[PDB]
PDB file of all heavy atoms in Angstrom:
ATOM      1  N   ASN A 147     159.923 117.630  43.406  1.00  0.00           N
ATOM      2  CA  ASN A 147     160.082 118.822  42.587  1.00  0.00           C
ATOM      3  C   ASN A 147     160.476 118.348  41.193  1.00  0.00           C
ATOM      4  O   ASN A 147     161.629 117.951  40.970  1.00  0.00           O
ATOM      5  CB  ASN A 147     161.133 119.794  43.174  1.00  0.00           C
ATOM      6  CG  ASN A 147     161.296 121.105  42.418  1.00  0.00           C
ATOM      7  OD1 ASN A 147     160.973 121.238  41.224  1.00  0.00           O
ATOM      8  ND2 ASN A 147     161.864 122.098  43.084  1.00  0.00           N
ATOM      9  N   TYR A 148     159.499 118.367  40.272  1.00  0.00           N
ATOM     10  CA  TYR A 148     159.676 117.896  38.902  1.00  0.00           C
ATOM     11  C   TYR A 148     160.674 118.744  38.112  1.00  0.00           C
ATOM     12  O   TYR A 148     161.552 118.177  37.447  1.00  0.00           O
ATOM     13  CB  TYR A 148     158.328 117.680  38.178  1.00  0.00           C
ATOM     14  CG  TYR A 148     158.482 116.949  36.864  1.00  0.00           C
ATOM     15  CD1 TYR A 148     159.069 115.680  36.814  1.00  0.00           C
ATOM     16  CD2 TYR A 148     158.172 117.573  35.656  1.00  0.00           C
ATOM     17  CE1 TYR A 148     159.286 115.031  35.599  1.00  0.00           C
ATOM     18  CE2 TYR A 148     158.367 116.923  34.435  1.00  0.00           C
ATOM     19  CZ  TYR A 148     158.940 115.659  34.414  1.00  0.00           C
ATOM     20  OH  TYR A 148     159.176 115.017  33.229  1.00  0.00           O
ATOM     21  N   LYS A 149     160.615 120.082  38.261  1.00  0.00           N
ATOM     22  CA  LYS A 149     161.545 120.996  37.590  1.00  0.00           C
ATOM     23  C   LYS A 149     163.027 120.723  37.932  1.00  0.00           C
ATOM     24  O   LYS A 149     163.842 120.556  37.022  1.00  0.00           O
ATOM     25  CB  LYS A 149     161.161 122.465  37.841  1.00  0.00           C
ATOM     26  CG  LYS A 149     162.071 123.472  37.136  1.00  0.00           C
ATOM     27  CD  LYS A 149     161.877 123.463  35.634  1.00  0.00           C
ATOM     28  CE  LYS A 149     163.034 124.075  34.920  1.00  0.00           C
ATOM     29  NZ  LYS A 149     162.815 124.037  33.460  1.00  0.00           N
ATOM     30  N   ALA A 150     163.350 120.650  39.240  1.00  0.00           N
ATOM     31  CA  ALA A 150     164.688 120.388  39.776  1.00  0.00           C
ATOM     32  C   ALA A 150     165.158 119.006  39.370  1.00  0.00           C
ATOM     33  O   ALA A 150     166.352 118.840  39.094  1.00  0.00           O
ATOM     34  CB  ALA A 150     164.693 120.521  41.297  1.00  0.00           C
ATOM     35  N   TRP A 151     164.229 118.019  39.304  1.00  0.00           N
ATOM     36  CA  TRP A 151     164.594 116.672  38.871  1.00  0.00           C
ATOM     37  C   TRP A 151     165.040 116.697  37.422  1.00  0.00           C
ATOM     38  O   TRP A 151     166.117 116.199  37.133  1.00  0.00           O
ATOM     39  CB  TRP A 151     163.486 115.625  39.111  1.00  0.00           C
ATOM     40  CG  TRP A 151     163.880 114.273  38.583  1.00  0.00           C
ATOM     41  CD1 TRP A 151     164.763 113.400  39.146  1.00  0.00           C
ATOM     42  CD2 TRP A 151     163.514 113.712  37.313  1.00  0.00           C
ATOM     43  NE1 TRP A 151     164.956 112.320  38.315  1.00  0.00           N
ATOM     44  CE2 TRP A 151     164.190 112.478  37.190  1.00  0.00           C
ATOM     45  CE3 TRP A 151     162.654 114.121  36.274  1.00  0.00           C
ATOM     46  CZ2 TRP A 151     164.021 111.640  36.083  1.00  0.00           C
ATOM     47  CZ3 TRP A 151     162.513 113.303  35.166  1.00  0.00           C
ATOM     48  CH2 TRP A 151     163.197 112.082  35.073  1.00  0.00           C
ATOM     49  N   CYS A 152     164.238 117.302  36.517  1.00  0.00           N
ATOM     50  CA  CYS A 152     164.555 117.450  35.087  1.00  0.00           C
ATOM     51  C   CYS A 152     165.933 118.069  34.854  1.00  0.00           C
ATOM     52  O   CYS A 152     166.708 117.557  34.042  1.00  0.00           O
ATOM     53  CB  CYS A 152     163.462 118.249  34.376  1.00  0.00           C
ATOM     54  SG  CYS A 152     161.855 117.414  34.333  1.00  0.00           S
ATOM     55  N   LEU A 153     166.236 119.166  35.579  1.00  0.00           N
ATOM     56  CA  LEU A 153     167.498 119.880  35.448  1.00  0.00           C
ATOM     57  C   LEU A 153     168.670 119.047  35.906  1.00  0.00           C
ATOM     58  O   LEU A 153     169.726 119.144  35.302  1.00  0.00           O
ATOM     59  CB  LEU A 153     167.485 121.255  36.159  1.00  0.00           C
ATOM     60  CG  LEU A 153     166.471 122.298  35.686  1.00  0.00           C
ATOM     61  CD1 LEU A 153     166.831 123.672  36.224  1.00  0.00           C
ATOM     62  CD2 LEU A 153     166.394 122.379  34.159  1.00  0.00           C
ATOM     63  N   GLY A 154     168.474 118.241  36.951  1.00  0.00           N
ATOM     64  CA  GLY A 154     169.500 117.347  37.484  1.00  0.00           C
ATOM     65  C   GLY A 154     169.687 116.098  36.642  1.00  0.00           C
ATOM     66  O   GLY A 154     170.820 115.687  36.382  1.00  0.00           O
ATOM     67  N   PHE A 155     168.569 115.501  36.176  1.00  0.00           N
ATOM     68  CA  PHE A 155     168.565 114.248  35.404  1.00  0.00           C
ATOM     69  C   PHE A 155     169.018 114.365  33.933  1.00  0.00           C
ATOM     70  O   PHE A 155     169.635 113.436  33.413  1.00  0.00           O
ATOM     71  CB  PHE A 155     167.179 113.584  35.477  1.00  0.00           C
ATOM     72  CG  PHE A 155     167.127 112.153  34.987  1.00  0.00           C
ATOM     73  CD1 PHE A 155     167.493 111.099  35.822  1.00  0.00           C
ATOM     74  CD2 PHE A 155     166.687 111.855  33.701  1.00  0.00           C
ATOM     75  CE1 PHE A 155     167.434 109.771  35.367  1.00  0.00           C
ATOM     76  CE2 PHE A 155     166.623 110.532  33.252  1.00  0.00           C
ATOM     77  CZ  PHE A 155     167.006 109.500  34.080  1.00  0.00           C
ATOM     78  N   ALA A 156     168.665 115.465  33.255  1.00  0.00           N
ATOM     79  CA  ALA A 156     168.994 115.624  31.840  1.00  0.00           C
ATOM     80  C   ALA A 156     170.479 115.554  31.507  1.00  0.00           C
ATOM     81  O   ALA A 156     170.805 114.804  30.581  1.00  0.00           O
ATOM     82  CB  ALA A 156     168.344 116.861  31.262  1.00  0.00           C
ATOM     83  N   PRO A 157     171.413 116.214  32.266  1.00  0.00           N
ATOM     84  CA  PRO A 157     172.843 116.089  31.926  1.00  0.00           C
ATOM     85  C   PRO A 157     173.391 114.679  32.140  1.00  0.00           C
ATOM     86  O   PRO A 157     174.212 114.205  31.345  1.00  0.00           O
ATOM     87  CB  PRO A 157     173.519 117.128  32.825  1.00  0.00           C
ATOM     88  CG  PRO A 157     172.594 117.309  33.969  1.00  0.00           C
ATOM     89  CD  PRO A 157     171.218 117.152  33.397  1.00  0.00           C
ATOM     90  N   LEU A 158     172.882 113.991  33.184  1.00  0.00           N
ATOM     91  CA  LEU A 158     173.262 112.630  33.528  1.00  0.00           C
ATOM     92  C   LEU A 158     172.825 111.637  32.450  1.00  0.00           C
ATOM     93  O   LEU A 158     173.614 110.778  32.061  1.00  0.00           O
ATOM     94  CB  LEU A 158     172.688 112.233  34.902  1.00  0.00           C
ATOM     95  CG  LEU A 158     173.288 112.909  36.157  1.00  0.00           C
ATOM     96  CD1 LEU A 158     172.619 112.382  37.422  1.00  0.00           C
ATOM     97  CD2 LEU A 158     174.814 112.695  36.250  1.00  0.00           C
ATOM     98  N   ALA A 159     171.578 111.766  31.956  1.00  0.00           N
ATOM     99  CA  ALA A 159     171.022 110.885  30.937  1.00  0.00           C
ATOM    100  C   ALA A 159     171.613 111.138  29.537  1.00  0.00           C
ATOM    101  O   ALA A 159     171.854 110.182  28.794  1.00  0.00           O
ATOM    102  CB  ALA A 159     169.506 111.016  30.904  1.00  0.00           C
ATOM    103  N   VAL A 160     171.810 112.426  29.163  1.00  0.00           N
ATOM    104  CA  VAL A 160     172.349 112.762  27.841  1.00  0.00           C
ATOM    105  C   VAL A 160     173.852 112.469  27.762  1.00  0.00           C
ATOM    106  O   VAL A 160     174.334 112.020  26.725  1.00  0.00           O
ATOM    107  CB  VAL A 160     171.973 114.194  27.378  1.00  0.00           C
ATOM    108  CG1 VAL A 160     172.642 114.557  26.050  1.00  0.00           C
ATOM    109  CG2 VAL A 160     170.460 114.339  27.246  1.00  0.00           C
ATOM    110  N   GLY A 161     174.559 112.707  28.863  1.00  0.00           N
ATOM    111  CA  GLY A 161     176.002 112.529  28.921  1.00  0.00           C
ATOM    112  C   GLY A 161     176.678 113.724  28.284  1.00  0.00           C
ATOM    113  O   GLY A 161     176.026 114.741  28.022  1.00  0.00           O
ATOM    114  N   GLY A 162     177.981 113.599  28.030  1.00  0.00           N
ATOM    115  CA  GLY A 162     178.795 114.663  27.450  1.00  0.00           C
ATOM    116  C   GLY A 162     178.795 115.936  28.284  1.00  0.00           C
ATOM    117  O   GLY A 162     178.581 115.889  29.510  1.00  0.00           O
ATOM    118  N   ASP A 163     179.000 117.088  27.605  1.00  0.00           N
ATOM    119  CA  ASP A 163     179.006 118.400  28.255  1.00  0.00           C
ATOM    120  C   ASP A 163     177.623 118.780  28.749  1.00  0.00           C
ATOM    121  O   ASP A 163     176.651 118.698  27.997  1.00  0.00           O
ATOM    122  CB  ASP A 163     179.559 119.493  27.326  1.00  0.00           C
ATOM    123  CG  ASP A 163     179.826 120.792  28.060  1.00  0.00           C
ATOM    124  OD1 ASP A 163     180.916 120.920  28.659  1.00  0.00           O
ATOM    125  OD2 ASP A 163     178.924 121.663  28.076  1.00  0.00           O
ATOM    126  N   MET A 164     177.557 119.218  30.020  1.00  0.00           N
ATOM    127  CA  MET A 164     176.350 119.637  30.741  1.00  0.00           C
ATOM    128  C   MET A 164     175.625 120.852  30.124  1.00  0.00           C
ATOM    129  O   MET A 164     174.434 121.050  30.377  1.00  0.00           O
ATOM    130  CB  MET A 164     176.673 119.874  32.225  1.00  0.00           C
ATOM    131  CG  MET A 164     177.661 121.018  32.480  1.00  0.00           C
ATOM    132  SD  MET A 164     178.203 121.131  34.214  1.00  0.00           S
ATOM    133  CE  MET A 164     176.688 121.754  35.007  1.00  0.00           C
ATOM    134  N   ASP A 165     176.346 121.665  29.338  1.00  0.00           N
ATOM    135  CA  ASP A 165     175.802 122.869  28.716  1.00  0.00           C
ATOM    136  C   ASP A 165     175.542 122.703  27.213  1.00  0.00           C
ATOM    137  O   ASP A 165     175.266 123.702  26.544  1.00  0.00           O
ATOM    138  CB  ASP A 165     176.713 124.086  28.995  1.00  0.00           C
ATOM    139  CG  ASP A 165     176.997 124.355  30.465  1.00  0.00           C
ATOM    140  OD1 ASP A 165     176.025 124.559  31.237  1.00  0.00           O
ATOM    141  OD2 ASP A 165     178.193 124.390  30.843  1.00  0.00           O
ATOM    142  N   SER A 166     175.589 121.454  26.684  1.00  0.00           N
ATOM    143  CA  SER A 166     175.325 121.193  25.258  1.00  0.00           C
ATOM    144  C   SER A 166     173.867 121.460  24.867  1.00  0.00           C
ATOM    145  O   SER A 166     172.996 121.549  25.733  1.00  0.00           O
ATOM    146  CB  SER A 166     175.682 119.754  24.898  1.00  0.00           C
ATOM    147  OG  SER A 166     174.760 118.831  25.451  1.00  0.00           O
ATOM    148  N   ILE A 167     173.618 121.567  23.553  1.00  0.00           N
ATOM    149  CA  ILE A 167     172.306 121.745  22.931  1.00  0.00           C
ATOM    150  C   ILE A 167     171.398 120.525  23.299  1.00  0.00           C
ATOM    151  O   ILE A 167     170.249 120.718  23.686  1.00  0.00           O
ATOM    152  CB  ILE A 167     172.503 121.908  21.381  1.00  0.00           C
ATOM    153  CG1 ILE A 167     173.405 123.126  20.993  1.00  0.00           C
ATOM    154  CG2 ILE A 167     171.195 121.877  20.592  1.00  0.00           C
ATOM    155  CD1 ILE A 167     172.916 124.572  21.357  1.00  0.00           C
ATOM    156  N   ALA A 168     171.934 119.292  23.196  1.00  0.00           N
ATOM    157  CA  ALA A 168     171.208 118.042  23.500  1.00  0.00           C
ATOM    158  C   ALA A 168     170.766 117.951  24.966  1.00  0.00           C
ATOM    159  O   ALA A 168     169.666 117.475  25.240  1.00  0.00           O
ATOM    160  CB  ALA A 168     172.041 116.831  23.125  1.00  0.00           C
ATOM    161  N   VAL A 169     171.604 118.432  25.897  1.00  0.00           N
ATOM    162  CA  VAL A 169     171.245 118.452  27.318  1.00  0.00           C
ATOM    163  C   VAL A 169     170.082 119.438  27.497  1.00  0.00           C
ATOM    164  O   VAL A 169     169.107 119.095  28.160  1.00  0.00           O
ATOM    165  CB  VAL A 169     172.455 118.770  28.254  1.00  0.00           C
ATOM    166  CG1 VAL A 169     171.997 119.044  29.681  1.00  0.00           C
ATOM    167  CG2 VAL A 169     173.473 117.636  28.242  1.00  0.00           C
ATOM    168  N   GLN A 170     170.174 120.632  26.858  1.00  0.00           N
ATOM    169  CA  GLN A 170     169.144 121.676  26.903  1.00  0.00           C
ATOM    170  C   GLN A 170     167.841 121.188  26.275  1.00  0.00           C
ATOM    171  O   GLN A 170     166.765 121.419  26.848  1.00  0.00           O
ATOM    172  CB  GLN A 170     169.624 122.968  26.224  1.00  0.00           C
ATOM    173  CG  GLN A 170     170.486 123.838  27.137  1.00  0.00           C
ATOM    174  CD  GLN A 170     171.666 124.491  26.448  1.00  0.00           C
ATOM    175  OE1 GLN A 170     171.644 124.819  25.255  1.00  0.00           O
ATOM    176  NE2 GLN A 170     172.730 124.716  27.200  1.00  0.00           N
ATOM    177  N   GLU A 171     167.940 120.493  25.126  1.00  0.00           N
ATOM    178  CA  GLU A 171     166.783 119.922  24.409  1.00  0.00           C
ATOM    179  C   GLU A 171     166.029 118.915  25.275  1.00  0.00           C
ATOM    180  O   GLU A 171     164.807 118.998  25.379  1.00  0.00           O
ATOM    181  CB  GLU A 171     167.220 119.220  23.107  1.00  0.00           C
ATOM    182  CG  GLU A 171     167.286 120.130  21.890  1.00  0.00           C
ATOM    183  CD  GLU A 171     167.467 119.412  20.564  1.00  0.00           C
ATOM    184  OE1 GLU A 171     166.650 118.514  20.245  1.00  0.00           O
ATOM    185  OE2 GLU A 171     168.423 119.759  19.834  1.00  0.00           O
ATOM    186  N   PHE A 172     166.768 117.969  25.897  1.00  0.00           N
ATOM    187  CA  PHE A 172     166.194 116.911  26.710  1.00  0.00           C
ATOM    188  C   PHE A 172     165.551 117.402  27.981  1.00  0.00           C
ATOM    189  O   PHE A 172     164.510 116.853  28.349  1.00  0.00           O
ATOM    190  CB  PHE A 172     167.201 115.782  26.983  1.00  0.00           C
ATOM    191  CG  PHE A 172     166.610 114.515  27.571  1.00  0.00           C
ATOM    192  CD1 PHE A 172     165.668 113.770  26.864  1.00  0.00           C
ATOM    193  CD2 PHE A 172     167.038 114.033  28.798  1.00  0.00           C
ATOM    194  CE1 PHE A 172     165.145 112.582  27.395  1.00  0.00           C
ATOM    195  CE2 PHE A 172     166.523 112.836  29.321  1.00  0.00           C
ATOM    196  CZ  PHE A 172     165.593 112.113  28.611  1.00  0.00           C
ATOM    197  N   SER A 173     166.138 118.428  28.658  1.00  0.00           N
ATOM    198  CA  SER A 173     165.526 118.933  29.895  1.00  0.00           C
ATOM    199  C   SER A 173     164.200 119.654  29.588  1.00  0.00           C
ATOM    200  O   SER A 173     163.283 119.630  30.403  1.00  0.00           O
ATOM    201  CB  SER A 173     166.493 119.806  30.703  1.00  0.00           C
ATOM    202  OG  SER A 173     166.535 121.161  30.305  1.00  0.00           O
ATOM    203  N   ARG A 174     164.100 120.229  28.382  1.00  0.00           N
ATOM    204  CA  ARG A 174     162.914 120.911  27.899  1.00  0.00           C
ATOM    205  C   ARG A 174     161.807 119.871  27.600  1.00  0.00           C
ATOM    206  O   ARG A 174     160.672 120.049  28.057  1.00  0.00           O
ATOM    207  CB  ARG A 174     163.260 121.776  26.670  1.00  0.00           C
ATOM    208  CG  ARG A 174     162.086 122.547  26.065  1.00  0.00           C
ATOM    209  CD  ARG A 174     162.383 123.117  24.677  1.00  0.00           C
ATOM    210  NE  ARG A 174     162.675 122.082  23.670  1.00  0.00           N
ATOM    211  CZ  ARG A 174     161.759 121.343  23.042  1.00  0.00           C
ATOM    212  NH1 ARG A 174     160.469 121.481  23.331  1.00  0.00           N
ATOM    213  NH2 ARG A 174     162.129 120.443  22.139  1.00  0.00           N
ATOM    214  N   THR A 175     162.146 118.778  26.865  1.00  0.00           N
ATOM    215  CA  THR A 175     161.182 117.723  26.538  1.00  0.00           C
ATOM    216  C   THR A 175     160.745 116.956  27.784  1.00  0.00           C
ATOM    217  O   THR A 175     159.577 116.569  27.865  1.00  0.00           O
ATOM    218  CB  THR A 175     161.638 116.843  25.363  1.00  0.00           C
ATOM    219  OG1 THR A 175     162.864 116.196  25.699  1.00  0.00           O
ATOM    220  CG2 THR A 175     161.769 117.625  24.067  1.00  0.00           C
ATOM    221  N   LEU A 176     161.655 116.769  28.770  1.00  0.00           N
ATOM    222  CA  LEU A 176     161.307 116.124  30.050  1.00  0.00           C
ATOM    223  C   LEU A 176     160.322 117.012  30.779  1.00  0.00           C
ATOM    224  O   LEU A 176     159.314 116.520  31.274  1.00  0.00           O
ATOM    225  CB  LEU A 176     162.518 115.949  30.984  1.00  0.00           C
ATOM    226  CG  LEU A 176     163.388 114.732  30.832  1.00  0.00           C
ATOM    227  CD1 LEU A 176     164.706 114.946  31.582  1.00  0.00           C
ATOM    228  CD2 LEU A 176     162.684 113.463  31.356  1.00  0.00           C
ATOM    229  N   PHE A 177     160.617 118.327  30.852  1.00  0.00           N
ATOM    230  CA  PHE A 177     159.752 119.268  31.568  1.00  0.00           C
ATOM    231  C   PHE A 177     158.411 119.542  30.872  1.00  0.00           C
ATOM    232  O   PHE A 177     157.471 119.995  31.532  1.00  0.00           O
ATOM    233  CB  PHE A 177     160.493 120.532  32.046  1.00  0.00           C
ATOM    234  CG  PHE A 177     159.684 121.281  33.083  1.00  0.00           C
ATOM    235  CD1 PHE A 177     159.581 120.802  34.386  1.00  0.00           C
ATOM    236  CD2 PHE A 177     158.949 122.414  32.731  1.00  0.00           C
ATOM    237  CE1 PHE A 177     158.722 121.415  35.307  1.00  0.00           C
ATOM    238  CE2 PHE A 177     158.155 123.067  33.672  1.00  0.00           C
ATOM    239  CZ  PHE A 177     158.032 122.551  34.951  1.00  0.00           C
ATOM    240  N   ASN A 178     158.306 119.199  29.557  1.00  0.00           N
ATOM    241  CA  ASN A 178     157.068 119.296  28.777  1.00  0.00           C
ATOM    242  C   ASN A 178     156.081 118.243  29.280  1.00  0.00           C
ATOM    243  O   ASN A 178     154.877 118.389  29.063  1.00  0.00           O
ATOM    244  CB  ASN A 178     157.321 119.031  27.289  1.00  0.00           C
ATOM    245  CG  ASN A 178     157.865 120.173  26.482  1.00  0.00           C
ATOM    246  OD1 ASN A 178     157.757 121.348  26.849  1.00  0.00           O
ATOM    247  ND2 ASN A 178     158.433 119.840  25.331  1.00  0.00           N
ATOM    248  N   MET A 179     156.575 117.169  29.926  1.00  0.00           N
ATOM    249  CA  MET A 179     155.644 116.160  30.439  1.00  0.00           C
ATOM    250  C   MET A 179     154.870 116.670  31.661  1.00  0.00           C
ATOM    251  O   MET A 179     155.429 117.414  32.472  1.00  0.00           O
ATOM    252  CB  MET A 179     156.350 114.844  30.766  1.00  0.00           C
ATOM    253  CG  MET A 179     156.586 113.965  29.543  1.00  0.00           C
ATOM    254  SD  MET A 179     157.488 112.420  29.875  1.00  0.00           S
ATOM    255  CE  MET A 179     158.943 113.066  30.663  1.00  0.00           C
ATOM    256  N   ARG A 180     153.577 116.290  31.777  1.00  0.00           N
ATOM    257  CA  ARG A 180     152.777 116.676  32.944  1.00  0.00           C
ATOM    258  C   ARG A 180     153.365 115.908  34.155  1.00  0.00           C
ATOM    259  O   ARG A 180     153.616 114.709  34.029  1.00  0.00           O
ATOM    260  CB  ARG A 180     151.281 116.384  32.727  1.00  0.00           C
ATOM    261  CG  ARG A 180     150.386 117.173  33.685  1.00  0.00           C
ATOM    262  CD  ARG A 180     148.895 116.977  33.424  1.00  0.00           C
ATOM    263  NE  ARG A 180     148.440 115.632  33.778  1.00  0.00           N
ATOM    264  CZ  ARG A 180     147.186 115.203  33.677  1.00  0.00           C
ATOM    265  NH1 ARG A 180     146.230 116.016  33.242  1.00  0.00           N
ATOM    266  NH2 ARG A 180     146.874 113.963  34.023  1.00  0.00           N
ATOM    267  N   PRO A 181     153.703 116.583  35.281  1.00  0.00           N
ATOM    268  CA  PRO A 181     154.406 115.883  36.375  1.00  0.00           C
ATOM    269  C   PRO A 181     153.917 114.500  36.795  1.00  0.00           C
ATOM    270  O   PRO A 181     154.738 113.608  37.047  1.00  0.00           O
ATOM    271  CB  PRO A 181     154.421 116.907  37.506  1.00  0.00           C
ATOM    272  CG  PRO A 181     154.401 118.213  36.822  1.00  0.00           C
ATOM    273  CD  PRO A 181     153.565 118.030  35.581  1.00  0.00           C
TER     274      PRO A 181
END
Side-chain angles (χ1 to χ4, degrees):
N147 184 338
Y148 191 58
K149 182 70 199 179
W151 177 75
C152 295
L153 299 195
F155 193 83
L158 290 181
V160 175
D163 191 84
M164 64 188 288
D165 305 302
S166 71
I167 301 297
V169 169
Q170 278 140 31
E171 272 191 55
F172 192 62
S173 85
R174 180 194 62 79
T175 61
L176 274 165
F177 195 75
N178 279 339
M179 279 177 305
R180 199 176 70 179

